[PDB]
Amino acid sequence: GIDPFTLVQRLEHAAKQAAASATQTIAAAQHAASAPKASAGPQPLLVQSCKAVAEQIPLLVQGVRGSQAQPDSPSAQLALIAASQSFLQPGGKMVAAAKASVPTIQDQASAMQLSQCAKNLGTALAELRTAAQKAQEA
């Protein structure tokens, strides 16, 4: 009957919205940066993770597109699964940093924007983290 993609199904969907939400979170985080001007090195965890996440975003989508083309390919599967878990590492950091940086952002627009972005990214990771989990160990 109807046998769908399964496991990679949730990977595709979660990684797409993760990549989307990540980009939005990055654009908000480094828009203001909750870094004080008086110090010897106030490098915001946001921006540090933003650059990390920014390079992981294409990997997600690359994995996604690979899974779309070859859902029955362990090469594409493990690629997406690995990329997902690789994205979670810096991605989760930016989420944690974002929520704590919101109240310390002087620009109200950026603060409220970051709040929504991190809320999306956090939930995106919630999907992706569980998605790759099911696809990996089953």
UniProtKB/Swiss-Prot annotation:
Subunit details: Part of a complex composed of THSD1, PTK2/FAK1, TLN1 and VCL. Interacts with THSD1; this promotes interaction with PTK2/FAK1 and VCL. Interacts with NRAP and LAYN. Interacts with SYNM. Interacts with ITGB1; the interaction is prevented by competitive binding of ITGB1BP1. Binds with high affinity to VCL and with low affinity to integrins. Interacts with APBB1IP; this inhibits VCL binding. Interacts with PTK2/FAK1. Interacts with PIP5K1C. Interacts with F-actin. Interacts with SVEP1.
Species: Mus musculus
Domain remark in the UniProt entry: Consists of an N-terminal FERM domain linked via a short unstructured region to a large flexible C-terminal rod which contains 13 amphipathic helical bundles (R1-R13). The rod begins with a five-helix bundle (R1) followed by three four-helix bundles (R2-R4). These are followed by a series of eight five-helix bundles (R5-R7 and R9-R13) in which the N- and C-termini are positioned at opposite ends of the bundle, creating a linear chain. The four-helix bundle R8 does not disrupt the chain because it is inserted into a loop in the R7 five-helix bundle.
Function noted in UniProt: High molecular weight cytoskeletal protein concentrated at regions of cell-matrix and cell-cell contacts. Involved in connections of major cytoskeletal structures to the plasma membrane. With KANK1 co-organize the assembly of cortical microtubule stabilizing complexes (CMSCs) positioned to control microtubule-actin crosstalk at focal adhesions (FAs) rims.
Domain of life the protein comes from: Eukaryota
Compartment list: Cell projection, Ruffle membrane; Cytoplasm, Cytoskeleton; Cell surface; Cell junction, Focal adhesion
Modified sites of kind Phosphoserine: S115
Protein name: Talin-1
Chain intervals for the UniProt region annotation (Helical bundle R4): 7-138
